Design a protein around this ligand. Structure first.
Ligand code: ATP
Ligand code: GDP
Lengths: 636, 261
């Protein structure tokens, strides 16, 4: 059995975070009479030898996150889904700080959507006990994560309330049980436990200034002991240990640090927050937010290399919260495509990653350089009055949510930019915050995020753009135009959302449904292959092979495949001819003789002993072109 | 005006309109509805006169919103540029002891004419992008034609500067010439004291105009005040490095306006 969880503490800018934990841990000393606000996340671990019939002496680690808003950019890295979350009221300012909790709870829901949260009042000596009303009214079960219990400990001193809170923590930890698994008492191989023991023992035998450990040292320690791990067991073992928080290791190939292992996580977390606290009150030659290389044994390079790897370097935090007024050339309600991403709150590490994803993409419309101005919530990378992209962030009147208004020109060069930024935002959103884009069939189908598109029938002077949900607009794919209740006038789909229709791709891949005849229902035209999804049809008067896609392939994935398939164009590689919707198909050249495997299986005599050379030459040419295109075929 | 207090405090009130909730306006943009609702007394015709007496404060934008160049954000945005090589940008500094009162709002108002290429109606127009702020302006026709006229502060210098950056191209030279001509007109009409030739200063004025150059790309910019480049262009057309008389840079790229380039 494995008995180890994470008890993360959550709250804002000064509350019972480092004070509550002391009596929760029953730390008697409390030598620091006046302690400062937390820098980093302050990892600590404390075992609970439960004095009852059950003897599961579980040891769990607390990560009491810093509450100041300047460290908020790095917190979502350490928000795992295998943990129990706390919250702190600061009941001194009752009925007000409960509202201040809502961004934190929303972030917890976005990151760890299936973990219980326990709310804890941290003031009784001062004041205002009506906060439990609002917690029972709007904060209970309205989009927020699954609240389990709420407490009102005095925090300054031990008491019956604190004991009840500790028992509640014990009960909720021992009854975690995500999707009926009972994590707190699951079963793992003993090799993992032994590796954890040796790692936490070696934690005390590393240099303080640099506890980073190379993979060679880990292979040394596995050799010194009698572990039964091989090269094929470490990639899962260290990942499981990382999920338990014993040591942080990163498996992203793009960020070239997977060789290093970060034992003693508190050191790494504290170093991550050192740059965010240094300032200069001198001459403001540089705008607020930008910074260059300014001040040990070769560690200086590794520092900002790690910051760049984490994308904390230009410091996206403390970066010019006020935006300068921007006056676009064409804003006559018809030359601009606008899309909105209405969400209840902005997730913590959203903008610092977003303005760090579109930033590095210089080869747009492909290498020329774009002008750019960065603020805490925008990019606005613009090339010319006819080619730009403004990814802003405003609040609508009489609207408590947060919006992400992307404004792009509607011309040829704007469709590409809109589809390329929408794809990046969607990928970020589904990769970092899966709890937001999560369907909710139970209850109303809110999904928390409503992606709107703005459209106006009148060619300018409409004075207002009508909203339209992107899913409802997507279901309107039967035709090619949208129209109101008064159908005398209509708007093409391409002008208001050129990403749903395959418009951001090069126009030489138009479906051209008028001249295409194709019978999907019969199977005698499926003869290409055997029980496949490819059919035979005729397009432009020529015999071709179409590839009908099932419901599995999403539109975004298909577009991401087509954008790289369209630019290949070699005479030894099957070249695309068209693609389109109704249904999601793909037309390509028809190989008259079919694949080579069937011929080898049944027509072994057809090869005239010199075709065996021509096939090899053509395949070699194809492989040469593919490797010249810096793409690896991987399955031939 | 029989009551000066009323006029002064009306100007003050228009300069201090604030709305809760962080509305869709970046700092320095006000809407007529907001200003009418902000003043507790919702007058009918005096509101029209107040919006019409701003011939002094609040320029009209789109007949529904007002720009207030004296209340714009004073935080210089983190702004990059297409070109960043020393041989691809022309930089002209205007060193001053201090910024006169109303200088940075007069410069913006003057720089809101849009015809540096259309030549005052010879062509139709060419609308650029703009990034107004209290101490600067950015105009962008293309990644090859742009202008950034903004204040700058240098290390260990108690003065204030007006660094103008343009691309080192033909359109960059056109923009530099137009901007320099307009700024010289503004300095001549509204702030003659900075251009005043002090006899006690012996040919020295509060304004000093520098051109930044670099013989080799990557090195630090060196300053030469224009009153020497005028004579050096009277003699020849090239600037020569005194240490190495082979690194020669034309005056067609350090200051094209001197030689009518
Ligand atoms: N353009 C074409 N002309 C002729 N035959 C083709 C063409 N494209 C594919 N085929 C053949 O039709 C069949 C299609 O195989 P396909 O690539 O769809 O297989 P798969 O990806 O493993 O299967 P699936 O996607 O259905 O799970 C194969 O036998 C292939 O050789
Ligand atoms: N009077 C009083 N002060 C408290 C109480 N709980 C916490 N504090 C104060 O809050 C501080 C804790 O700081 P903390 O929130 O952990 O720092 P942060 O995590 O970086 O925001 C301590 O210095 C305490 O003085 C309480 O119940 N009563």
């Amino acid at each position: 059995p494995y008995n180890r969880m994470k008890l993360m503490i959550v709250g804002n800018t000064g509350s019972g975070k480092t004070t509550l934990l002391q009596q929760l841990m029953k730390t008697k000393k409390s030598d620091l009479g006046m302690q400062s606000a937390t820098v980093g996340i302050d990892v600590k671990d404390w075992p609970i030898q439960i004095r009852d019939k059950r003897k599961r002496d579980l040891v769990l680690n607390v990560w009491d996150f810093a509450g100041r808003e300047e460290f908020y950019s790095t917190h979502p890295h350490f928000m795992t889904q295998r943990a129990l979350y706390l919250a702190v009221y600061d009941l001194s300012k009752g009925q007000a700080e409960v509202d201040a909790m809502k961004p934190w709870l929303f972030n917890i829901k976005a990151r760890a959507s299936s973990s219980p949260v326990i709310l804890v009042g941290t003031h009784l000596d001062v004041s205002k006990a009506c906060m439990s009303k609002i917690t029972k009214e709007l904060l209970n079960k309205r989009g927020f994560p699954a609240i389990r219990d709420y407490h009102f400990v005095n925090a300054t001193e031990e008491s019956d309330a604190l004991a009840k809170l500790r028992k509640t923590i014990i009960n909720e930890s021992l009854n975690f049980k995500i999707r009926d698994q009972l994590v707190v008492g699951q079963l793992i191989p003993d090799c993992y436990v032994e590796l954890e023991k040796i790692i936490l023992s070696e934690r005390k035998n590393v240099p303080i200034e640099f506890p980073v450990i190379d993979r060679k040292r880990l292979l040394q320690l596995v050799r010194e002991n009698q572990l039964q791990l091989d090269e094929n067991e470490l990639p899962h073992a260290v990942h499981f240990l990382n999920e338990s928080g014993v040591l942080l290791h990163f498996q992203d190939p793009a960020l070239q640090l997977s060789d290093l292992y970060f034992v003693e996580p508190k050191w790494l977390c504290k170093i991550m927050a050192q740059i965010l606290t240094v300032k200069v009150e001198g001459c403001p030659k540089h705008p607020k937010g930008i910074i260059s290389r300014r001040d040990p044994k070769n560690y200086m390079t590794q520092y900002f290399k790690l910051l760049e790897k984490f994308q904390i370097a230009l410091v996206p935090s403390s970066l010019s919260d006020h935006r300068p007024v921007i006056e676009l050339p064409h804003c006559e309600n018809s030359e601009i495509i606008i899309r909105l991403y209405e969400m209840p709150y902005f997730p913590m590490g959203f903008w610092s990653r977003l303005i760090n994803r579109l930033l590095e993409i210089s080869p747009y419309m492909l290498a020329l350089r774009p002008n750019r101005m960065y603020w805490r919530q925008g990019i606005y990378l613009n090339w010319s009055p006819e080619a730009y992209c403004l990814v802003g962030s405003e609040v609508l009147d009489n609207h408590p949510e947060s919006f992400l208004k992307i404004t792009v020109p509607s011309c040829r060069k704007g469709c590409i930019l809109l589809g390329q930024v929408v794809d990046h935002i969607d990928s970020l959103m589904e990769e970092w915050f899966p709890g937001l884009l999560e369907i909710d069939i139970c209850g109303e189908g809110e999904t928390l995020l409503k992606k709107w598109a703005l459209y106006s029938f009148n060619d300018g002077e409409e004075h207002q753009k009508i909203l339209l949900d992107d899913l409802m607009k997507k279901a309107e794919e039967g035709d090619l135009l949208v129209n109101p209740d008064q159908p005398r006038l209509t708007i093409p789909i391409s002008q208001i959302a050129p990403d749903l229709i395959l418009a951001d791709l090069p126009r030489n891949i138009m479906l051209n449904n008028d001249e295409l005849e194709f019978e999907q229902a019969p199977e005698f035209l499926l003869g290409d292959g055997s029980f496949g999804s490819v059919y035979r049809a005729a397009y432009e008067g020529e015999e071709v092979a179409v590839k009908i896609f099932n419901k599995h392939t999403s539109l975004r994935l298909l577009r991401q495949e087509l954008v790289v398939l369209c630019h290949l164009h070699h005479p030894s590689l099957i070249s695309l001819l068209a693609a389109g919707i109704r249904p999601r198909m793909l037309v390509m050249e028809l190989a008259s003789k079919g694949s080579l495997d069937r011929l080898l299986q049944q027509d072994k005599a057809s090869l005239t002993r010199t075709l065996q050379h021509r096939i090899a030459l053509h395949v070699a040419d194809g492989l040469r072109y593919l490797h010249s295109a810096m793409i690896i075929y991987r399955d031939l | 005006f029989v009551e000066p207090k009323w006029l002064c405090k009306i100007m003050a009130q228009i300069l201090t309109v604030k709305v809760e909730g962080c509305p869709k306006h970046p700092k320095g943009i006000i809407s007529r509805r907001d200003v009418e609702k902000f003043l507790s007394k919702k007058r009918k015709f005096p509101k029209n006169y107040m919006t019409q007496y701003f011939k002094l404060i609040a320029l009209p934008i789109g007949e529904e919103y007002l720009l207030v160049p004296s209340s714009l954000s004073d935080h210089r945005p983190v702004i990059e540029l297409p070109h960043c090589e020393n041989s691809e940008i022309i930089i002209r500094l205007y060193e001053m002891p201090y910024f006169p009162m109303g200088f940075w709002s007069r410069l913006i108002n003057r720089l809101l004419e849009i015809s540096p290429y259309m030549l005052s109606g010879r062509e139709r127009a060419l609308r650029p992008n703009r990034m107004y702020w209290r101490q600067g302006i950015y105009l962008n026709w293309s990644p090859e034609a742009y202008c950034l006229v903004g204040s700058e502060v240098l290390d260990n210098h108690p003065e204030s500067f007006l660094k103008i950056t343009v691309p080192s191209c033909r359109k960059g030279c056109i923009l530099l010439g137009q901007v320099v001509d307009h700024i010289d007109s503004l300095m001549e009409e509204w702030f003659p004291g900075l251009l005043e030739i002090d006899i006690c200063g012996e040919g020295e004025t509060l304004l000093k105009k520098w051109a930044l150059y670099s013989f080799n790309d990557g090195e630090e910019h060196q300053k030469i005040l224009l009153d020497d480049l005028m004579k050096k262009a009277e003699e020849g057309d090239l600037l020569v490095n005194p240490d190495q008389p082979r690194l020669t840079i034309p005056i067609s790229q350090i200051a094209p306006d001197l030689i009518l380039a």
